[PDB]
Amino acid sequence: VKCKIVVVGDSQCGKTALLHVFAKDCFPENYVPTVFENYTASFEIDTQRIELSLWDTSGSPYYDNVRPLSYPDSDAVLICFDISRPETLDSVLKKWKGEIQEFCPNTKMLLVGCKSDLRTDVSTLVELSNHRQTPVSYDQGANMAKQIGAATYIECSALQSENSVRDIFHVATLACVNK
Numbered sequence: 001v002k003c004k005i006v007v008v009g010d011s012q013c014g015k016t017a018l019l020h021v022f023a024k025d026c027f028p029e030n031y032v033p034t035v036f037e038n039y040t041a042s043f044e045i046d047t048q049r050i051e052l053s054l055w056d057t058s059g060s061p062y063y064d065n066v067r068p069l070s071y072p073d074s075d076a077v078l079i080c081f082d083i084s085r086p087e088t089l090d091s092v093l094k095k096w097k098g099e100i101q102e103f104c105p106n107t108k109m110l111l112v113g114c115k116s117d118l119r120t121d122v123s124t125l126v127e128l129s130n131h132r133q134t135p136v137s138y139d140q141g142a143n144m145a146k147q148i149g150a151a152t153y154i155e156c157s158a159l160q161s162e163n164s165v166r167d168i169f170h171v172a173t174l175a176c177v178n179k
């Protein structure tokens with residue numbers, strides 16, 4: 001069949017890189033703010049090829065009135081945050097959960113931790129440490145997922161592991177195949 005997946009989350013948390021790596025098997029060479037972009041892809045499940053319609057959105061508040069146009073008929077929504085920026089995890093509870101429940105009631109939500117490669121990146125550890133902070137831990141991610149009612153919590157690194165990215169869509173597809 002066909003599955004519609006929409007990806008939301010704060011600006012620069014890694015939404016576009018995640019989608020580009022999965023659909024185009026290519027990591028973006030530069031950063032360009034996204035408004036809307038649509039990608040097509042297909043995933044095989046138990047001797048079956050499912051067609052995926054993927055929607056990239058803007059993490060910017062300036063597009064709060066535009067973003068909702070992509071929600072209708074969504075099978076699953078991936079809420080992303082940046083493991084290297086704890087503040088982006090707060091947005092999941094403060095903004096994203098409420099927006100999805102408002103426009104996508106009954107849709108399956110998946111909490112996705114992006115840029116896992118930075119959790120052990122020395123420069124990042126040092127910068128965060130100089131301000132009494134640490135990268136988001138797996139446990140913090142998992143607890144947030146339960147708090148907002150997400151089907152599950154999963155992490156990835158579009159930069160270092162293409163497989164971690166494919167796993168996300170593998171799970172997303174399964175969560176929809178059996179609604």
Ligand SMILES: Nc1nc2c(ncn2[C@@H]2O[C@H](COP(=O)(O)OP(=O)(O)OP(=O)(O)O)[C@@H](O)[C@H]2O)c(=O)[nH]1
Pocket residue numbers: 009010011012013014015016017018028030031032033034035057058059060114115116117118156157158159160
């Ligand atoms: N270290 C690391 N950097 C990443 C990873 N993914 C994306 N980035 C970097 O993070 C920046 C923003 O990533 P994007 O994918 O464009 O972010 P976005 O969430 O789509 O941003 P908006 O369109 O503004 O909402 C870029 O400079 C990427 O190169 C990742 O897995 N690891």
Ligand SMILES: [Mg+2]
Pocket residue numbers: 015016017032033034056057
């Ligand atoms: Mg983007």
